[PDB]
Design a binder for this molecule. Structure first.
Ligand SMILES: CCC(CC)CN(C[C@@H](O)[C@H](Cc1ccccc1)NC(=O)O[C@H]1CO[C@H]2OCC[C@H]21)S(=O)(=O)c1ccc([C@H](O)CO)cc1
Lengths: 99, 99
């Protein structure tokens, strides 16, 4: 589909057997999701934006479904105010900017 | 143009007569640029990111050219980690997400 940007580009995603709302964010290299208790091993990481840094947990090879498009990649879990779908997964679903 | 997301969507912008590089950021409501000198008056404003809130200078009705497309809107100036073009201007240049 085509998503205009009058409002936030929020879409439903499926991760860890759960449905969630997340931004399609071309400004994020990686995917950052709100706190959730995923199984498996992880690595600590700190990520910075406006206001400073937050501590997150890096999970690798996580399966996410975005608007029925399947993708698998790194997911960072931490106290983010919004679920953020970054470029590492946007490319996998064939997402582009156009103007 | 059509922009793939295997690299950061960085573009050249023209603001206040000066060229700069900025990131097309669909996850940003607003446009925020690093500290710079801009003509005209401004108002103190607050904006929040992934790591908290910062103080910015709000310039309204500013001429800004993005990858050859002209826009006139609000530009926030403050300690953002990188220059970001937000939806308030992406809409003006007719930018959409497509997959
Ligand atoms: C300048 C920050 C960007 C460029 C460095 C990167 N950011 C993504 C932007 O899209 C954020 C997304 C966001 C939306 C709402 C609340 C919190 C975050 N938008 C945003 O700050 O917009 C400003 C302005 O407009 C206003 O509307 C929204 C809030 C206000 S990030 O989240 O901080 C992030 C950092 C590092 C990674 C690495 O890849 C991981 O390793 C991945 C993501």
């Amino acid at each position: 589909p085509q998503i205009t940007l009058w409002k936030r580009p929020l879409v439903t995603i499926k991760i860890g057997g759960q449905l969630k709302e997340a931004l399609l964010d071309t400004g994020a290299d990686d995917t950052v999701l709100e706190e959730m208790n995923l199984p498996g091993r992880w690595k600590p990481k700190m990520i910075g934006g406006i206001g400073g840094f937050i501590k997150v947990r890096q999970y690798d090879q996580i399966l996410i479904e975005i608007c029925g498009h399947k993708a698998i990649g790194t997911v960072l879990v931490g106290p983010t105010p919004v679920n953020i779908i970054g470029r590492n997964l946007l490319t996998q679903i064939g997402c582009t900017l156009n103007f």
